[PDB]
Protein backbone atom coordinates (compact mmCIF):
# COMPACT_ATOMS: atom_id res chain seq x y z
CA UNK A 1 0.00 0.00 0.00
CA UNK A 2 1.92 3.05 -1.32
CA UNK A 3 0.48 6.51 -1.20
CA UNK A 4 1.43 10.09 -1.97
CA UNK A 5 0.34 13.23 -0.26
CA UNK A 6 -1.80 16.05 -1.35
CA UNK A 7 -0.43 19.47 -0.76
CA UNK A 8 -3.75 21.10 0.43
CA UNK A 9 -2.05 24.51 0.55
CA UNK A 10 -1.21 24.52 -3.14
CA UNK A 11 -4.57 22.87 -4.23
CA UNK A 12 -7.31 24.63 -6.15
CA UNK A 13 -9.73 22.73 -3.98
CA UNK A 14 -8.17 23.89 -0.65
CA UNK A 15 -11.31 25.86 0.22
CA UNK A 16 -13.74 23.17 -0.91
CA UNK A 17 -11.97 20.51 1.06
CA UNK A 18 -11.85 22.57 4.24
CA UNK A 19 -15.53 23.47 3.94
CA UNK A 20 -16.78 19.87 3.13
CA UNK A 21 -14.50 18.62 5.79
CA UNK A 22 -16.05 20.57 8.66
CA UNK A 23 -19.40 22.45 8.38
CA UNK A 24 -20.75 21.86 5.06
CA UNK A 25 -19.61 18.18 5.38
CA UNK A 26 -21.83 15.98 3.11
CA UNK A 27 -21.91 12.95 0.95
CA UNK A 28 -24.15 12.75 -2.04
CA UNK A 29 -25.60 9.93 -4.26
CA UNK A 30 -26.58 9.90 -7.98
CA UNK A 31 -28.46 7.27 -9.95
CA UNK A 32 -28.23 6.90 -13.51
CA UNK A 33 -29.84 4.48 -15.96
CA UNK A 34 -26.78 3.04 -17.80
CA UNK A 35 -27.04 1.80 -21.37
CA UNK A 36 -25.49 -1.57 -21.21
CA UNK A 37 -26.65 -2.95 -24.60
CA UNK A 38 -23.17 -3.16 -26.07
CA UNK A 39 -21.51 -4.03 -22.74
CA UNK A 40 -23.87 -6.97 -22.40
CA UNK A 41 -23.38 -8.23 -25.97
CA UNK A 42 -19.49 -8.18 -25.39
CA UNK A 43 -19.87 -10.03 -22.09
CA UNK A 44 -22.28 -12.64 -23.75
CA UNK A 45 -19.97 -12.92 -26.78
CA UNK A 46 -16.88 -13.61 -24.53
CA UNK A 47 -18.84 -15.76 -22.20
CA UNK A 48 -17.68 -13.39 -19.41
CA UNK A 49 -19.44 -13.39 -16.10
CA UNK A 50 -21.27 -9.93 -15.97
CA UNK A 51 -20.48 -8.94 -12.35
CA UNK A 52 -16.64 -9.17 -12.41
CA UNK A 53 -16.58 -7.59 -15.90
CA UNK A 54 -18.53 -4.73 -14.58
CA UNK A 55 -16.63 -4.44 -11.12
CA UNK A 56 -13.64 -4.30 -13.51
CA UNK A 57 -14.52 -1.34 -15.57
CA UNK A 58 -15.53 0.46 -12.39
CA UNK A 59 -12.13 -0.38 -10.84
CA UNK A 60 -10.28 0.96 -13.91
CA UNK A 61 -12.06 4.22 -13.53
CA UNK A 62 -11.16 4.44 -9.86
CA UNK A 63 -7.58 3.68 -10.95
CA UNK A 64 -7.79 6.48 -13.59
CA UNK A 65 -8.54 9.58 -11.59
CA UNK A 66 -7.02 10.24 -8.15
CA UNK A 67 -10.04 11.95 -6.69
CA UNK A 68 -11.52 8.39 -6.12
CA UNK A 69 -8.56 7.19 -4.18
CA UNK A 70 -8.32 9.61 -1.23
CA UNK A 71 -8.05 8.83 2.45
CA UNK A 72 -6.93 10.44 5.70
CA UNK A 73 -3.80 8.77 6.77
CA UNK A 74 -2.27 9.60 10.13
CA UNK A 75 -3.86 13.12 9.70
CA UNK A 76 -2.68 13.92 6.02
CA UNK A 77 -4.89 13.83 2.78
CA UNK A 78 -3.41 11.00 0.82
CA UNK A 79 -3.95 9.26 -2.50
CA UNK A 80 -3.51 5.51 -2.63
CA UNK A 81 -1.38 4.40 -5.63
CA UNK A 82 -4.20 1.93 -6.33
CA UNK A 83 -7.51 0.96 -5.03
CA UNK A 84 -8.84 -2.53 -5.02
CA UNK A 85 -12.64 -3.36 -5.50
CA UNK A 86 -14.62 -4.82 -2.64
CA UNK A 87 -17.86 -6.37 -3.89
CA UNK A 88 -20.55 -8.30 -2.22
CA UNK A 89 -21.26 -11.99 -2.57
CA UNK A 90 -24.64 -13.43 -1.76
CA UNK A 91 -25.16 -16.68 0.21
CA UNK A 92 -28.56 -18.43 -0.81
CA UNK A 93 -28.65 -20.95 2.05
CA UNK A 94 -28.64 -18.38 4.89
CA UNK A 95 -29.89 -15.52 2.85
CA UNK A 96 -26.95 -13.37 3.99
CA UNK A 97 -24.05 -11.72 2.31
CA UNK A 98 -20.25 -11.12 2.40
CA UNK A 99 -17.98 -8.46 1.15
CA UNK A 100 -14.64 -9.71 -0.57
CA UNK A 101 -11.98 -7.63 -2.34
CA UNK A 102 -9.74 -8.68 -5.23
CA UNK A 103 -6.45 -7.07 -6.24
CA UNK A 104 -6.92 -4.77 -9.26
CA UNK A 105 -4.89 -4.90 -12.57
CA UNK A 106 -5.49 -2.97 -15.71
CA UNK A 107 -5.77 -6.12 -17.76
CA UNK A 108 -9.30 -7.52 -17.37
CA UNK A 109 -8.22 -11.01 -18.04
CA UNK A 110 -5.62 -10.93 -15.28
CA UNK A 111 -8.15 -9.38 -12.80
CA UNK A 112 -10.73 -12.00 -13.89
CA UNK A 113 -8.32 -14.83 -12.80
CA UNK A 114 -7.76 -13.12 -9.41
CA UNK A 115 -11.53 -12.54 -9.02
CA UNK A 116 -12.67 -16.08 -9.72
CA UNK A 117 -9.94 -17.44 -7.59
CA UNK A 118 -11.02 -15.34 -4.58
CA UNK A 119 -14.71 -16.26 -5.10
CA UNK A 120 -13.67 -19.99 -5.44
CA UNK A 121 -11.80 -19.93 -2.17
CA UNK A 122 -14.05 -17.55 -0.20
CA UNK A 123 -17.56 -17.67 -1.73
CA UNK A 124 -18.84 -20.13 0.79
CA UNK A 125 -17.22 -18.52 3.84
CA UNK A 126 -20.05 -16.83 5.87
CA UNK A 127 -17.91 -14.19 7.56
CA UNK A 128 -19.03 -10.65 6.74
CA UNK A 129 -15.33 -10.22 5.56
CA UNK A 130 -13.95 -13.63 4.57
CA UNK A 131 -10.62 -12.14 3.82
CA UNK A 132 -10.46 -9.06 5.98
CA UNK A 133 -10.50 -5.59 4.67
CA UNK A 134 -7.65 -3.33 3.32
CA UNK A 135 -7.43 0.54 3.61
CA UNK A 136 -7.61 1.25 -0.05
CA UNK A 137 -10.88 -0.46 -1.36
CA UNK A 138 -13.95 1.03 -3.20
CA UNK A 139 -17.32 -0.68 -2.68
CA UNK A 140 -19.53 -2.39 -5.42
CA UNK A 141 -22.85 -3.94 -4.32
CA UNK A 142 -25.14 -5.98 -6.41
CA UNK A 143 -28.82 -5.44 -5.80
CA UNK A 144 -30.13 -7.89 -8.56
CA UNK A 145 -33.79 -7.74 -7.31
CA UNK A 146 -34.82 -4.23 -8.06
CA UNK A 147 -34.86 -2.06 -11.08
CA UNK A 148 -34.51 1.06 -9.01
CA UNK A 149 -34.76 4.46 -10.24
CA UNK A 150 -32.95 5.60 -7.03
CA UNK A 151 -30.62 3.92 -4.69
CA UNK A 152 -29.19 6.04 -1.85
CA UNK A 153 -27.03 5.32 1.12
CA UNK A 154 -27.31 7.31 4.37
CA UNK A 155 -24.17 6.59 6.42
CA UNK A 156 -24.50 7.61 10.15
CA UNK A 157 -20.82 8.62 10.29
CA UNK A 158 -19.23 10.17 7.26
CA UNK A 159 -15.97 11.59 8.65
CA UNK A 160 -13.15 10.72 6.27
CA UNK A 161 -15.43 8.24 4.59
CA UNK A 162 -13.88 8.99 1.11
CA UNK A 163 -14.06 5.49 -0.47
CA UNK A 164 -16.58 5.67 -3.39
CA UNK A 165 -19.74 3.16 -3.01
CA UNK A 166 -21.43 1.89 -6.21
CA UNK A 167 -24.81 -0.04 -6.27
CA UNK A 168 -25.79 -1.80 -9.34
CA UNK A 169 -29.43 -2.52 -9.91
CA UNK A 170 -31.31 -5.13 -12.10
CA UNK A 171 -31.14 -4.40 -15.84
CA UNK A 172 -34.17 -4.36 -17.97
CA UNK A 173 -35.17 -3.92 -21.56
CA UNK A 174 -36.32 -0.59 -22.91
CA UNK A 175 -37.09 -0.57 -26.72
CA UNK A 176 -33.71 -1.55 -28.20
CA UNK A 177 -31.62 -0.87 -25.17
CA UNK A 178 -30.69 -2.80 -22.08
CA UNK A 179 -30.44 -0.23 -19.27
CA UNK A 180 -28.98 -0.93 -15.76
CA UNK A 181 -29.66 1.27 -12.63
CA UNK A 182 -26.26 2.48 -11.31
CA UNK A 183 -25.83 4.64 -8.16
CA UNK A 184 -22.57 6.10 -6.81
CA UNK A 185 -22.28 7.80 -3.48
CA UNK A 186 -19.35 9.93 -2.89
CA UNK A 187 -18.06 12.24 -0.20
CA UNK A 188 -18.00 15.94 -1.21
CA UNK A 189 -14.61 16.84 0.35
CA UNK A 190 -12.74 14.74 -2.25
CA UNK A 191 -15.23 14.65 -5.18
CA UNK A 192 -17.22 17.38 -7.06
CA UNK A 193 -20.12 16.89 -9.55
CA UNK A 194 -17.47 17.31 -12.39
CA UNK A 195 -15.60 14.28 -11.15
CA UNK A 196 -18.52 11.99 -10.72
CA UNK A 197 -19.66 13.34 -14.06
CA UNK A 198 -16.48 12.75 -15.89
CA UNK A 199 -16.35 9.23 -14.42
CA UNK A 200 -19.91 8.36 -15.43
CA UNK A 201 -19.35 9.59 -19.03
CA UNK A 202 -16.11 7.64 -19.27
CA UNK A 203 -18.04 4.57 -17.87
CA UNK A 204 -20.79 4.86 -20.54
CA UNK A 205 -18.09 5.25 -23.16
CA UNK A 206 -15.92 2.34 -21.98
CA UNK A 207 -18.94 0.12 -21.65
CA UNK A 208 -19.77 0.79 -25.25
CA UNK A 209 -16.21 0.21 -26.65
CA UNK A 210 -14.63 -2.42 -24.68
CA UNK A 211 -14.24 -5.50 -26.83
CA UNK A 212 -13.83 -8.20 -24.12
CA UNK A 213 -10.38 -8.96 -23.29
Amino acid sequence: TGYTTVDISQWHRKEHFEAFQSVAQCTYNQTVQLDITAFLKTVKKNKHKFYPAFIHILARLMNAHPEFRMAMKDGELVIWDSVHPCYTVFHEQTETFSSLWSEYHDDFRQFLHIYSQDVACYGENLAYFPKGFIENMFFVSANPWVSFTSFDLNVANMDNFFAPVFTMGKYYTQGDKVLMPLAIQVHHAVCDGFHVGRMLNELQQYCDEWQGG
Copy 2:
Protein backbone atom coordinates in the same frame (compact mmCIF):
# COMPACT_ATOMS: atom_id res chain seq x y z
CA UNK B 1 -57.46 -2.13 23.59
CA UNK B 2 -54.83 -4.50 21.90
CA UNK B 3 -51.29 -4.83 23.50
CA UNK B 4 -49.20 -6.87 21.01
CA UNK B 5 -46.55 -9.28 21.78
CA UNK B 6 -43.16 -10.04 20.68
CA UNK B 7 -40.41 -12.28 20.63
CA UNK B 8 -36.97 -11.62 21.79
CA UNK B 9 -34.30 -12.22 19.07
CA UNK B 10 -31.62 -14.79 20.02
CA UNK B 11 -28.78 -12.94 18.56
CA UNK B 12 -26.13 -15.58 19.23
CA UNK B 13 -28.29 -17.94 16.97
CA UNK B 14 -28.86 -15.32 14.22
CA UNK B 15 -27.28 -15.89 10.83
CA UNK B 16 -26.94 -12.04 10.64
CA UNK B 17 -25.39 -11.56 13.96
CA UNK B 18 -22.18 -10.17 12.41
CA UNK B 19 -24.10 -7.75 10.11
CA UNK B 20 -26.29 -6.70 12.97
CA UNK B 21 -23.33 -5.55 15.01
CA UNK B 22 -21.59 -3.87 12.21
CA UNK B 23 -24.68 -1.97 11.17
CA UNK B 24 -25.38 -0.89 14.80
CA UNK B 25 -22.02 0.53 15.27
CA UNK B 26 -19.73 1.78 12.54
CA UNK B 27 -21.09 0.79 9.37
CA UNK B 28 -24.31 2.18 10.79
CA UNK B 29 -26.31 3.33 7.70
CA UNK B 30 -29.86 3.67 6.58
CA UNK B 31 -30.80 3.42 2.82
CA UNK B 32 -33.49 4.42 0.32
CA UNK B 33 -34.61 3.13 -2.96
CA UNK B 34 -37.38 4.06 -5.39
CA UNK B 35 -39.13 1.93 -7.88
CA UNK B 36 -41.81 2.74 -10.46
CA UNK B 37 -44.44 0.16 -9.43
CA UNK B 38 -46.74 -0.94 -12.22
CA UNK B 39 -50.21 -0.70 -10.84
CA UNK B 40 -52.22 -1.19 -13.98
CA UNK B 41 -53.98 -4.33 -12.84
CA UNK B 42 -54.08 -3.03 -9.29
CA UNK B 43 -55.68 0.24 -10.32
CA UNK B 44 -58.31 -1.54 -12.56
CA UNK B 45 -59.33 -3.72 -9.52
CA UNK B 46 -59.73 -0.67 -7.17
CA UNK B 47 -61.79 1.41 -9.64
CA UNK B 48 -64.08 -1.55 -10.38
CA UNK B 49 -64.79 -2.79 -6.75
CA UNK B 50 -65.34 0.63 -5.31
CA UNK B 51 -62.36 1.29 -3.11
CA UNK B 52 -60.44 4.20 -1.95
CA UNK B 53 -56.88 3.66 -3.41
CA UNK B 54 -54.90 4.78 -0.37
CA UNK B 55 -56.23 2.17 2.14
CA UNK B 56 -56.19 -0.66 -0.49
CA UNK B 57 -52.53 0.09 -0.99
CA UNK B 58 -51.69 0.54 2.74
CA UNK B 59 -53.37 -2.82 3.28
CA UNK B 60 -51.00 -4.38 0.80
CA UNK B 61 -47.98 -2.78 2.39
CA UNK B 62 -49.13 -3.92 5.83
CA UNK B 63 -49.50 -7.53 4.66
CA UNK B 64 -45.91 -7.43 3.52
CA UNK B 65 -44.61 -5.99 6.81
CA UNK B 66 -46.66 -8.62 8.62
CA UNK B 67 -45.23 -11.51 6.47
CA UNK B 68 -41.49 -10.83 7.15
CA UNK B 69 -39.97 -10.44 10.55
CA UNK B 70 -37.08 -8.36 9.26
CA UNK B 71 -39.56 -5.47 9.11
CA UNK B 72 -40.88 -5.65 12.63
CA UNK B 73 -37.79 -5.25 14.76
CA UNK B 74 -37.31 -2.65 17.54
CA UNK B 75 -35.13 -2.24 20.52
CA UNK B 76 -37.37 -2.78 23.43
CA UNK B 77 -36.13 -2.42 27.02
CA UNK B 78 -32.55 -2.82 25.72
CA UNK B 79 -33.20 -5.81 23.40
CA UNK B 80 -33.71 -6.71 19.78
CA UNK B 81 -37.24 -7.96 19.48
CA UNK B 82 -39.64 -9.04 16.72
CA UNK B 83 -43.26 -7.71 17.22
CA UNK B 84 -46.06 -10.19 16.38
CA UNK B 85 -47.63 -7.56 14.24
CA UNK B 86 -47.00 -4.08 13.09
CA UNK B 87 -49.76 -1.49 12.30
CA UNK B 88 -49.61 1.19 9.58
CA UNK B 89 -49.28 4.90 10.37
CA UNK B 90 -50.12 6.83 7.25
CA UNK B 91 -50.50 10.43 6.49
CA UNK B 92 -53.67 12.41 6.05
CA UNK B 93 -53.58 15.98 4.51
CA UNK B 94 -55.72 18.92 5.76
CA UNK B 95 -56.61 21.33 2.80
CA UNK B 96 -57.75 24.33 4.86
CA UNK B 97 -54.54 24.63 6.88
CA UNK B 98 -52.18 22.88 4.47
CA UNK B 99 -50.85 20.77 7.27
CA UNK B 100 -50.61 17.04 7.70
CA UNK B 101 -51.30 14.49 10.40
CA UNK B 102 -50.02 10.93 10.99
CA UNK B 103 -52.78 8.37 11.85
CA UNK B 104 -52.46 4.67 12.71
CA UNK B 105 -54.93 1.94 12.14
CA UNK B 106 -54.94 -1.56 13.57
CA UNK B 107 -53.82 -4.04 10.95
CA UNK B 108 -55.88 -7.16 9.88
CA UNK B 109 -55.36 -9.92 7.48
CA UNK B 110 -58.75 -9.26 5.83
CA UNK B 111 -59.11 -6.19 3.72
CA UNK B 112 -62.74 -5.71 4.77
CA UNK B 113 -61.97 -5.83 8.49
CA UNK B 114 -59.02 -3.40 7.78
CA UNK B 115 -61.08 -1.01 5.65
CA UNK B 116 -63.81 -0.70 8.25
CA UNK B 117 -61.15 0.23 10.78
CA UNK B 118 -59.34 2.62 8.51
CA UNK B 119 -62.70 4.33 7.74
CA UNK B 120 -63.71 4.71 11.35
CA UNK B 121 -60.23 6.17 12.02
CA UNK B 122 -60.26 8.50 9.04
CA UNK B 123 -63.84 9.58 10.07
CA UNK B 124 -63.03 10.31 13.73
CA UNK B 125 -59.58 11.80 13.27
CA UNK B 126 -59.36 13.00 9.56
CA UNK B 127 -59.99 16.56 10.73
CA UNK B 128 -58.07 16.69 13.92
CA UNK B 129 -55.14 19.02 13.37
CA UNK B 130 -52.82 17.38 16.04
CA UNK B 131 -49.74 15.83 14.49
CA UNK B 132 -50.57 12.34 15.97
CA UNK B 133 -54.26 12.74 16.63
CA UNK B 134 -54.29 9.24 18.12
CA UNK B 135 -50.98 9.29 19.73
CA UNK B 136 -48.41 6.79 18.53
CA UNK B 137 -47.80 3.07 19.46
CA UNK B 138 -44.62 1.12 19.82
CA UNK B 139 -44.98 -0.94 16.64
CA UNK B 140 -45.83 0.91 13.64
CA UNK B 141 -44.29 1.18 10.06
CA UNK B 142 -44.89 4.45 8.09
CA UNK B 143 -46.64 5.35 4.79
CA UNK B 144 -46.40 8.83 3.17
CA UNK B 145 -48.85 10.05 0.61
CA UNK B 146 -46.97 12.28 -1.68
CA UNK B 147 -49.63 12.74 -4.48
CA UNK B 148 -48.25 16.00 -6.06
CA UNK B 149 -45.50 14.48 -7.87
CA UNK B 150 -44.37 11.69 -10.02
CA UNK B 151 -40.89 11.41 -8.48
CA UNK B 152 -38.06 9.35 -9.92
CA UNK B 153 -36.51 9.70 -6.45
CA UNK B 154 -37.64 10.15 -3.01
CA UNK B 155 -35.67 9.75 0.13
CA UNK B 156 -35.47 10.37 3.83
CA UNK B 157 -32.21 11.33 5.63
CA UNK B 158 -33.18 10.86 9.25
CA UNK B 159 -30.58 12.48 11.56
CA UNK B 160 -30.97 10.13 14.42
CA UNK B 161 -30.92 6.53 13.15
CA UNK B 162 -30.14 4.50 16.25
CA UNK B 163 -32.52 1.63 16.36
CA UNK B 164 -34.76 3.36 14.00
CA UNK B 165 -35.77 0.04 12.49
CA UNK B 166 -39.27 0.78 11.35
CA UNK B 167 -39.74 0.88 7.53
CA UNK B 168 -40.88 4.22 5.92
CA UNK B 169 -42.59 3.95 2.37
CA UNK B 170 -43.44 7.04 0.24
CA UNK B 171 -45.99 6.94 -2.43
CA UNK B 172 -45.86 9.36 -5.33
CA UNK B 173 -48.36 10.26 -8.16
CA UNK B 174 -49.30 7.60 -10.59
CA UNK B 175 -49.04 8.38 -14.18
CA UNK B 176 -49.31 6.82 -17.68
CA UNK B 177 -46.45 5.12 -19.65
CA UNK B 178 -47.66 3.57 -22.92
CA UNK B 179 -50.07 0.84 -21.80
CA UNK B 180 -49.10 0.93 -18.20
CA UNK B 181 -49.94 2.99 -15.18
CA UNK B 182 -46.98 3.32 -12.85
CA UNK B 183 -46.65 4.62 -9.27
CA UNK B 184 -43.28 5.91 -7.76
CA UNK B 185 -42.90 4.05 -4.62
CA UNK B 186 -39.92 4.56 -2.11
CA UNK B 187 -38.78 2.60 0.89
CA UNK B 188 -36.27 3.43 3.54
CA UNK B 189 -34.86 0.80 5.76
CA UNK B 190 -32.07 0.56 8.36
CA UNK B 191 -29.19 -1.78 7.32
CA UNK B 192 -28.97 -3.41 10.78
CA UNK B 193 -32.26 -5.22 10.21
CA UNK B 194 -32.63 -5.27 6.44
CA UNK B 195 -30.24 -6.18 3.66
CA UNK B 196 -30.77 -5.72 -0.01
CA UNK B 197 -32.28 -9.17 -0.45
CA UNK B 198 -35.09 -8.43 2.10
CA UNK B 199 -36.08 -5.14 0.52
CA UNK B 200 -35.75 -6.60 -2.95
CA UNK B 201 -37.84 -9.65 -2.17
CA UNK B 202 -40.29 -7.28 -0.47
CA UNK B 203 -40.70 -5.22 -3.60
CA UNK B 204 -40.85 -8.11 -5.89
CA UNK B 205 -43.61 -9.46 -3.64
CA UNK B 206 -45.38 -6.09 -3.72
CA UNK B 207 -45.58 -6.11 -7.50
CA UNK B 208 -47.25 -9.61 -7.25
CA UNK B 209 -49.67 -8.60 -4.51
CA UNK B 210 -50.60 -5.66 -6.62
CA UNK B 211 -51.22 -7.82 -9.69
CA UNK B 212 -53.00 -10.78 -8.05
CA UNK B 213 -55.22 -8.70 -5.86
CA UNK B 214 -58.84 -9.81 -6.23
CA UNK B 215 -60.11 -6.83 -4.28
CA UNK B 216 -61.11 -8.24 -0.76
Copy 3:
Protein backbone atom coordinates in the same frame (compact mmCIF):
# COMPACT_ATOMS: atom_id res chain seq x y z
CA THR C 1 -31.52 41.84 5.30
CA GLY C 2 -35.06 42.29 6.67
CA TYR C 3 -37.05 39.46 8.04
CA THR C 4 -40.04 38.43 9.89
CA THR C 5 -40.12 36.57 13.16
CA VAL C 6 -42.60 33.68 13.36
CA ASP C 7 -45.16 33.56 16.18
CA ILE C 8 -44.66 29.85 16.77
CA SER C 9 -47.57 29.68 19.10
CA GLN C 10 -50.06 30.63 16.34
CA TRP C 11 -48.37 28.60 13.65
CA HIS C 12 -50.46 25.72 12.26
CA ARG C 13 -47.15 23.78 12.06
CA LYS C 14 -46.07 24.46 15.70
CA GLU C 15 -46.03 20.67 16.57
CA HIS C 16 -44.38 19.52 13.32
CA PHE C 17 -41.73 22.09 13.65
CA GLU C 18 -41.18 21.00 17.25
CA ALA C 19 -40.97 17.33 16.26
CA PHE C 20 -38.68 18.01 13.27
CA GLN C 21 -36.29 20.07 15.25
CA SER C 22 -35.76 17.50 17.92
CA VAL C 23 -35.84 13.73 17.48
CA ALA C 24 -37.50 12.94 14.35
CA GLN C 25 -35.29 15.68 12.65
CA CYS C 26 -34.84 14.74 8.99
CA THR C 27 -34.07 16.01 5.58
CA TYR C 28 -35.46 14.71 2.37
CA ASN C 29 -34.57 14.74 -1.29
CA GLN C 30 -36.90 14.23 -4.33
CA THR C 31 -36.10 14.18 -8.02
CA VAL C 32 -38.36 14.80 -10.87
CA GLN C 33 -37.90 14.72 -14.62
CA LEU C 34 -39.13 18.19 -15.38
CA ASP C 35 -40.72 18.63 -18.82
CA ILE C 36 -38.66 21.55 -20.21
CA THR C 37 -39.98 21.11 -23.72
CA ALA C 38 -41.79 24.50 -23.92
CA PHE C 39 -39.20 26.24 -21.78
CA LEU C 40 -36.35 25.35 -23.93
CA LYS C 41 -38.28 26.48 -27.13
CA THR C 42 -38.58 29.86 -25.48
CA VAL C 43 -35.04 30.28 -24.01
CA LYS C 44 -34.05 29.59 -27.66
CA LYS C 45 -36.46 31.62 -29.89
CA ASN C 46 -35.08 34.41 -27.65
CA LYS C 47 -32.00 36.09 -26.37
CA HIS C 48 -31.56 33.44 -23.81
CA LYS C 49 -28.93 31.83 -21.75
CA PHE C 50 -30.59 28.74 -20.19
CA TYR C 51 -29.06 28.74 -16.64
CA PRO C 52 -30.03 32.23 -15.59
CA ALA C 53 -33.55 31.92 -16.89
CA PHE C 54 -33.93 28.71 -14.99
CA ILE C 55 -32.28 30.16 -11.82
CA HIS C 56 -34.77 33.05 -12.08
CA ILE C 57 -37.85 30.80 -12.08
CA LEU C 58 -36.66 28.90 -9.02
CA ALA C 59 -35.98 32.28 -7.29
CA ARG C 60 -39.61 33.39 -8.14
CA LEU C 61 -40.85 30.30 -6.48
CA MET C 62 -38.60 30.66 -3.48
CA ASN C 63 -39.74 34.25 -3.07
CA ALA C 64 -43.55 33.29 -3.31
CA HIS C 65 -43.81 30.88 -0.31
CA PRO C 66 -42.33 31.81 3.11
CA GLU C 67 -41.54 28.14 3.89
CA PHE C 68 -38.51 28.34 1.50
CA ARG C 69 -37.24 31.31 3.29
CA MET C 70 -36.84 30.32 6.98
CA ALA C 71 -33.69 30.34 9.13
CA MET C 72 -32.73 30.18 12.72
CA LYS C 73 -31.48 33.66 13.59
CA ASP C 74 -30.06 34.28 17.11
CA GLY C 75 -32.22 31.54 18.61
CA GLU C 76 -35.51 32.40 16.77
CA LEU C 77 -37.25 31.02 13.75
CA VAL C 78 -37.44 33.75 11.20
CA ILE C 79 -38.65 34.16 7.62
CA TRP C 80 -36.48 36.25 5.27
CA ASP C 81 -38.14 39.14 3.29
CA SER C 82 -36.27 37.67 0.30
CA VAL C 83 -33.84 34.97 -0.58
CA HIS C 84 -31.19 35.36 -3.24
CA PRO C 85 -30.01 32.35 -5.45
CA CYS C 86 -26.51 31.02 -4.80
CA TYR C 87 -25.52 29.17 -8.05
CA THR C 88 -22.55 27.19 -9.24
CA VAL C 89 -20.01 28.51 -11.78
CA PHE C 90 -17.70 25.95 -13.21
CA HIS C 91 -13.85 26.67 -14.09
CA GLU C 92 -12.65 24.54 -17.04
CA GLN C 93 -9.00 25.35 -16.54
CA THR C 94 -8.76 24.07 -13.00
CA GLU C 95 -11.84 21.65 -13.04
CA THR C 96 -13.17 23.34 -9.99
CA PHE C 97 -16.23 25.34 -9.15
CA SER C 98 -17.35 28.36 -7.01
CA SER C 99 -20.70 29.39 -5.62
CA LEU C 100 -21.89 32.92 -6.53
CA TRP C 101 -24.98 34.70 -5.42
CA SER C 102 -27.01 37.42 -7.10
CA GLU C 103 -29.60 39.71 -5.86
CA TYR C 104 -33.00 38.49 -6.62
CA HIS C 105 -35.39 40.69 -8.54
CA ASP C 106 -38.85 40.06 -9.61
CA ASP C 107 -38.39 41.21 -13.16
CA PHE C 108 -36.45 38.72 -15.27
CA ARG C 109 -34.47 41.43 -17.11
CA GLN C 110 -33.19 43.11 -14.05
CA PHE C 111 -32.11 39.76 -12.71
CA LEU C 112 -30.35 38.86 -15.90
CA HIS C 113 -28.41 42.14 -15.72
CA ILE C 114 -27.43 41.37 -12.14
CA TYR C 115 -26.47 37.79 -12.99
CA SER C 116 -24.33 38.74 -15.94
CA GLN C 117 -22.46 41.41 -13.89
CA ASP C 118 -21.84 38.85 -11.10
CA VAL C 119 -20.74 36.19 -13.51
CA ALA C 120 -18.45 38.56 -15.45
CA CYS C 121 -16.96 40.14 -12.34
CA TYR C 122 -16.47 36.91 -10.43
CA GLY C 123 -16.63 33.92 -12.72
CA GLU C 124 -12.90 33.50 -13.16
CA ASN C 125 -12.36 33.83 -9.38
CA LEU C 126 -11.21 30.66 -7.91
CA ALA C 127 -12.48 31.22 -4.47
CA TYR C 128 -15.07 28.83 -3.33
CA PHE C 129 -17.28 31.83 -2.40
CA PRO C 130 -15.83 34.80 -4.36
CA LYS C 131 -18.43 37.17 -2.86
CA GLY C 132 -18.74 35.48 0.50
CA PHE C 133 -21.85 33.86 1.91
CA ILE C 134 -24.90 36.06 2.87
CA GLU C 135 -27.49 34.78 5.45
CA ASN C 136 -30.49 34.46 3.16
CA MET C 137 -29.60 32.22 0.05
CA PHE C 138 -30.98 29.11 -1.50
CA PHE C 139 -28.76 26.86 -3.71
CA VAL C 140 -28.84 25.80 -7.32
CA SER C 141 -26.17 23.49 -8.50
CA ALA C 142 -25.83 22.71 -12.18
CA ASN C 143 -24.78 19.15 -12.81
CA PRO C 144 -24.61 19.12 -16.67
CA TRP C 145 -22.83 15.85 -17.29
CA VAL C 146 -25.46 13.31 -16.05
CA SER C 147 -29.12 12.74 -16.85
CA PHE C 148 -29.57 11.43 -13.45
CA THR C 149 -32.71 9.62 -12.33
CA SER C 150 -31.75 10.69 -8.80
CA PHE C 151 -29.69 13.19 -6.92
CA ASP C 152 -29.52 13.09 -3.10
CA LEU C 153 -27.70 15.44 -0.70
CA ASN C 154 -26.79 13.95 2.65
CA VAL C 155 -25.64 16.71 4.99
CA ALA C 156 -23.84 15.46 8.05
CA ASN C 157 -25.34 18.26 10.02
CA MET C 158 -28.85 19.25 9.52
CA ASP C 159 -29.39 21.57 12.48
CA ASN C 160 -31.26 24.66 11.26
CA PHE C 161 -30.22 23.92 7.69
CA PHE C 162 -33.36 25.32 6.15
CA ALA C 163 -32.19 26.73 2.91
CA PRO C 164 -33.50 24.64 -0.02
CA VAL C 165 -30.93 23.02 -2.38
CA PHE C 166 -31.89 22.42 -6.06
CA THR C 167 -29.64 20.40 -8.49
CA MET C 168 -30.05 20.45 -12.20
CA GLY C 169 -28.92 17.49 -14.27
CA LYS C 170 -28.54 17.16 -18.05
CA TYR C 171 -31.66 17.36 -20.10
CA TYR C 172 -32.42 14.76 -22.72
CA THR C 173 -34.85 13.86 -25.40
CA GLN C 174 -37.55 11.40 -24.88
CA GLY C 175 -40.44 10.93 -27.33
CA ASP C 176 -41.59 14.48 -28.33
CA LYS C 177 -40.48 15.77 -25.00
CA VAL C 178 -37.30 17.22 -23.59
CA LEU C 179 -36.79 16.42 -19.95
CA MET C 180 -34.51 17.70 -17.35
CA PRO C 181 -33.69 16.06 -13.99
CA LEU C 182 -34.30 18.41 -11.10
CA ALA C 183 -33.83 17.46 -7.50
CA ILE C 184 -34.75 19.41 -4.41
CA GLN C 185 -33.39 18.83 -0.86
CA VAL C 186 -35.33 20.51 2.04
CA HIS C 187 -35.52 20.18 5.74
CA HIS C 188 -38.72 18.84 7.16
CA ALA C 189 -38.92 21.25 10.09
CA VAL C 190 -39.84 23.89 7.47
CA CYS C 191 -41.05 21.94 4.40
CA ASP C 192 -43.59 19.17 4.23
CA GLY C 193 -44.49 17.06 1.15
CA PHE C 194 -47.17 19.56 0.21
CA HIS C 195 -44.89 22.52 0.00
CA VAL C 196 -42.34 20.75 -2.14
CA GLY C 197 -44.97 19.39 -4.58
CA ARG C 198 -46.85 22.68 -4.75
CA MET C 199 -43.60 24.31 -5.73
CA LEU C 200 -42.57 21.62 -8.18
CA ASN C 201 -46.11 21.91 -9.67
CA GLU C 202 -45.75 25.62 -10.04
CA LEU C 203 -42.18 25.30 -11.41
CA GLN C 204 -43.74 23.13 -14.25
CA GLN C 205 -46.55 25.65 -14.85
CA TYR C 206 -44.02 28.52 -15.06
CA CYS C 207 -41.74 26.70 -17.34
CA ASP C 208 -44.68 25.96 -19.71
CA GLU C 209 -46.05 29.54 -19.28
CA TRP C 210 -42.78 31.48 -19.47
CA GLN C 211 -43.07 34.18 -22.16
CA GLY C 212 -39.41 35.14 -22.47
CA GLY C 213 -39.90 38.45 -20.67
